[PDB]
């Protein structure tokens, strides 16, 4: 398959890894901080997803330095991964239009 499709698949796998790792690390970073809510794994996984998609409801978020650092990694991974899917779609469309034009 073409590069853009391979890259998209890879990006998806990497994002899943980051969501899982981010959830584990977020709990690790936040427990020990009075008042923190990102402290159990199931909801931390949910938090990682709404952060990677940049939805950010505000129901859960990190209060510590390391939790916030983990958060930035999750954000960047989500933004870049979805952006890469967009880039792959554009490449697919560009190629199809070239053909349709007989170029």
């Amino acid at each position: 398959s073409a590069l853009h499709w391979r890259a998209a698949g890879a990006a998806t796998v990497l994002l899943v890894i980051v969501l899982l790792a981010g959830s584990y690390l977020a709990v690790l970073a936040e427990r020990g901080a009075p008042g923190a809510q990102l402290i159990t794994y199931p909801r931390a996984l949910w938090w990682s997803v709404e952060t990677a998609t940049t939805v950010g409801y505000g129901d859960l978020y990190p209060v510590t330095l390391w939790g916030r650092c983990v958060a930035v990694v999750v954000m960047v991974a989500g933004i870049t991964s979805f952006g890469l899917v967009t880039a792959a779609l554009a490449t697919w469309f560009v190629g199809r239009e070239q053909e349709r034009r007989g170029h």
Partner: antibody
Amino acid sequence: QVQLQQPGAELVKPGASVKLSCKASGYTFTSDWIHWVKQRPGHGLEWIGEIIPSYGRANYNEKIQKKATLTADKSSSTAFMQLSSLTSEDSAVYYCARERGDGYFAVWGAGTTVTVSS
Amino acid sequence: DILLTQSPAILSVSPGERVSFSCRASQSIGTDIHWYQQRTNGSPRLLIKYASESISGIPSRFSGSGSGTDFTLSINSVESEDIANYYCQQSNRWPFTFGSGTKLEIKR
């Protein structure tokens, strides 16, 4: 079978210290946290602290004087709590409990009755 | 730190009657409350998780309800084996905390 095994009792001279143990069996996951809870005779349950074996990180109750130090041995699947410079105020039953990272203590040890006396 | 208030501290009920234990949290904690039973000379035993979720091995007699700041542990038709101390515990915010406990007494 018993998931958490703790010694029945420990006698400690005032000022001295002791190391309590909690041997765990059954399913074990990287998300497991081992907690320690203190209970004075006739009184309620007081959270002491927690440790995550898969990483070695430990957190403690900030409201009370820190008497404990938590450690864990992955190979022997054993968690330890070092209580130091104890006084009669430290005499109590100390329970270890297992939490699967989801907030509740699914299982508890039988508890170790610690007595601080000469 | 979240304060869990369990009042009254002692509940007196007659055999077979329905009883309800109260646990009030100092702030809203959704349904992140769990209940434990501790009989004389025994270790705590998980009865209900996340305010209303059943635990395998626990008599259907036990149920839980509530969300926010007010929670209830109910026993339908109490019997002798239910005599013990009952504690609530929250896991919504760090650190986890326990209520002061309520003792169940039976009037026979």
